[PDB]
Structure formats: C-alpha cells, structure tokens
Amino acid sequence: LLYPKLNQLSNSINAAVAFLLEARNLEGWWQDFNFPQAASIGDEWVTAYVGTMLATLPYAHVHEALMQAWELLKIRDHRPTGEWGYNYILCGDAATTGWALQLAAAVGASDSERAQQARAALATHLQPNGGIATFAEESIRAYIKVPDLANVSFQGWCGAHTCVSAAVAALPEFRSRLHDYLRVTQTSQGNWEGYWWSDHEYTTALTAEALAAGGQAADQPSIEQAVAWGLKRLCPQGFVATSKHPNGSTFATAWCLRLLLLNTVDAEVKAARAAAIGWLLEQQRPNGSWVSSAYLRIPYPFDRNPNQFPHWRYYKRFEGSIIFDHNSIFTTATVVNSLVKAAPML
Ligand SMILES: CC1(C)CCC[C@@]2(C)[C@@H]3CC[C@@]4(C)c5c(C(=O)O)cc(O)c(O)c5C[C@@H]4[C@@]3(C)CC[C@H]12
Numbered sequence: 608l609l610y611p612k613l614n615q616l617s618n619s620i621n622a623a624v625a626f627l628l629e630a631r632n633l634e635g636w637w638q639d640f641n642f643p644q645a646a647s648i649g650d651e652w653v654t655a656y657v658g659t660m661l662a663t664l665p666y667a668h669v670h671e672a673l674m675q676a677w678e679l680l681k682i683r684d685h686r687p688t689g690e691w692g693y694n695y696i697l698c699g700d701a702a703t704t705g706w707a708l709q710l711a712a713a714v715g716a717s718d719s720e721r722a723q724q725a726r727a728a729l730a731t732h733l734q735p736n737g738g739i740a741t742f743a744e745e746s747i748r749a750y751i752k753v754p755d756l757a758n759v760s761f762q763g764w765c766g767a768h769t770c771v772s773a774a775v776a777a778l779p780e781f782r783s784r785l786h787d788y789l790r791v792t793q794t795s796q797g798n799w800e801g802y803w804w805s806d807h808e809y810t811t812a813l814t815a816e817a818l819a820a821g822g823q824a825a826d827q828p829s830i831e832q833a834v835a836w837g838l839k840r841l842c843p844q845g846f847v848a849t850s851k852h853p854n855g856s857t858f859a860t861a862w863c864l865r866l867l868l869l870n871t872v873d874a875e876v877k878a879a880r881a882a883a884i885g886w887l888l889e890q891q892r893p894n895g896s897w898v899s900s901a902y903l904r905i906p907y908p909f910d911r912n913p914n915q916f917p918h919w920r921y922y923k924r925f926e927g928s929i930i931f932d933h934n935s936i937f938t939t940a941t942v943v944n945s946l947v948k949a950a951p952m953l
Pocket residue numbers: 642643644645646647693697750751803903904905923924925926
C-alpha cells in the first residue's frame with residue numbers, strides 16, 4: 608500500500624464532497640441537465656441519484672444532507688401515483704423513483720408511507736417480458752404535441768429498459784421479480800446495454816450488482832463475465848475510452864471501477880482498479896469536480912434499440928441528440944462514489 612496514494616484518495620474524495628455540498632441550490636437540491644426550450648433542469652432525479660451516490664460516506668454532515676434531500680423529495684407529493692420524475696413539471700418515471708427509493712433506504716425511510724406508495728407505483732411499470740419501463744405512455748405522450756411525433760409509436764420510450772430495470776433491481780422488493788429479465792438481456796460479451804445511457808458500464812455495473820446482492824450461485828458466472836468485460840474496457844492507463852472521449856470518459860471509468868469491485872480475489876482486477884483510481888485522481892479539477900461526461904441519449908419515441916442508432920448529434924428538437932450534465936454534479940457524484948467504494952480495496 609502506497610500511503611501517499613491512500614491519502615490522496617481521501618483528499619480527492621473530500622474535495623469532491625465539498626464541491627457537491629456547495630453545488631446545492633438555495634433550497635438544497637442538486638440540479639443537472641437542461642432542456643432549454645421548456646422542460647428546464649433536472650432536480651428530483653439528480654438529487655435522488657447524487658444522494659444515493661453519497662450514501663456510503665461515513666460523515667455525519669453528509670448523512671444530514673441526505674436526510675434533507677429525502678425531506679425535499681417527500682414535499683414533491685403532487686403526482687397521484689407517488690412517483691418522482693426529472694423535475695416538478697415532468698411526469699413520474701420509474702428510473703427516478705427507483706433512485707429515490709435507494710436514497711430512502713439510506714436514510715431509514717424504506718418503510719415510510721411515501722416509499723410504500725412509490726414502490727407500488729413501480730409495479731405498474733412492469734412489462735410482460737419481466738422488465739421495467741421508464742414511462743407510462745399516456746403520461747409522457749402529453750409532453751410531445753408537435754404533429755410529426757404526437758402520433759408515432761411510443762414503444763421505445765414505454766418499453767422495458769435494462770438501465771431502469773437494473774436500478775430498480777437494487778431494491779430488495781423487486782430484485783427477485785427482475786432476475787430473469789436481467790439474466791436474459793446479458794450480451795455474449797458479458798455486458799448489458801442501456802436505453803437512455805450512452806455508456807454500457809452504467810447498466811452493466813448496476814445489473815451485475817443486483818445479481819451479486821441476490822446471492823444466487825447460478826448468477827456468479829454472469830457476474831464474472833461482466834467483470835471480465837470491464838477488465839477489457841479499462842485500458843492499461845486506467846480509463847475507459849469512447850469515440851467521444853478517446854483519452855477516457857470519467858463517467859464510464861467510474862462505473863467500470865464499480866463493476867470491478869465485484870471480484871476481490873483476482874490480482875489483475877485489483878491492479879486494474881488501482882490504475883483507474885490513479886487516472887481518476889489525475890483528472891480531478893482544482894474545485895474538486897470531474898469534467899462532465901454523463902451522456903444521456905434522447906432516442907426517438909419509437910426507437911426500441913437506441914444501441915442500433917448510428918448518428919447522435921451532441922445537442923432543433925432533441926430526438927436523435929445527446930445531452931450531458933452541464934453542472935458536472937452527476938459525473939462528480941458518480942466518480943466520488945466509485946472512489947469511496949474502491950478505497951478500502953486499494
Ligand atoms: C431523457 C429524458 C427521459 C430525461 C427527462 C426529460 C425527458 C422526458 C424530456 C422532456 C423534455 C422534452 C419533452 C423535450 C423538450 C422540452 O420540453 O424542453 C424540447 C424538445 O425539443 C424535445 O425534443 C423534447 C423531448 C424531451 C423529453 C421527452 C425527452 C426524454 C427526456
């Protein structure tokens with residue numbers, strides 16, 4: 608163990624936590640992403656995700672910030688299903704609701720009336736193939752009023768989504784029901800592919816974590832296949848390269864680092880994690896943040912497989928475009944979660 612590197616990991620994590628706590632708005636929300644024409648900036652979703660990312664820190668002031676985040680979410684009680692969504696003006700969705708329920712668990716509110724209502728609402732999104740859809744068709748169709756899209760298929764936006772299913776499978780109440788869908792959607796390469804996210808490391812890490820949490824020995828080979836895929840994705844320099852970031856994506860690398868935590872015995876895996884930690888430490892900005900790289904696709908509503916859509920515009924309407932986390936809060940929270948989880952295994 609190189610104690611200077613252990614200490615820099617502490618200093619890096621602390622700088623990022625300070626960035627994130629200072630980056631809250633006057634009411635205490637984390638905000639990120641922007642649809643400038645009308646939907647504006649994410650809050651409920653971002654807050655649920657960031658709070659969940661910070662939930663493994665031991666700091667009492669961070670637990671207080673998560674308690675506050677949960678109180679903010681409970682005041683967002685305007686939707687009749689009890690779901691949360693991108694922000695106040697959007698309809699509920701399963702992915703935001705799943706992250707909010709993970710935050711609830713971290714602050715001891717899993718058994719609350721609101722958490723029970725929101726879990727029930729998730730059941731409505733279960734599909735005949737055993738996965739979870741992000742949106743109810745009639746709820747999201749209301750936001751698309753342009754003649755050219757108002758009457759197209761919504762079976763892309765309203766079909767089962769692996770990235771959403773993987774996040775909901777973090778909830779013990781759903782893990783068993785989603786198991787078979789998670790198993791059948793694994794590729795021959797050992798990864799999963801998401802719907803909304805560009806970076807397959809997100810879906811792959813969350814899916815492998817849900818299979819690990821279930822503890823079934825039948826799922827361990829699948830988890831090891833995913834870890835092997837992660838090892839291939841991480842280059843020797845310690846990053847995951849993408850077409851957009853051929854010198855490394857901080858968001859993809861962080862999720863890859865999380866995935867590699869699912870094998871604690873293999874020497875090559877431990878060395879790869881150490882390499883990823885080194886690279887992430889080098890990439891941190893002076894203010895504690897990492898550069899935005901959480902790329903969110905807006906497929907056309909009819910698109911059942913955005914992983915087969917060959918021409919995204921980095922953001923005119925937004926269908927066929929990619930947006931990102933302009934505040935770097937989403938990316939930074941992802942990175943600091945991966946570093947906090949990996950540090951004890953350095
Ligand atoms: C990616 C996700 C789910 C994130 C949570 C928000 C959500 C629902 C979007 C809300 C804003 C929308 C209706 C919009 C707007 C807008 O209202 O500002 C302007 C557009 O030109 C445009 O194509 C669109 C399409 C957008 C989504 C429907 C696409 C999907 C997206």
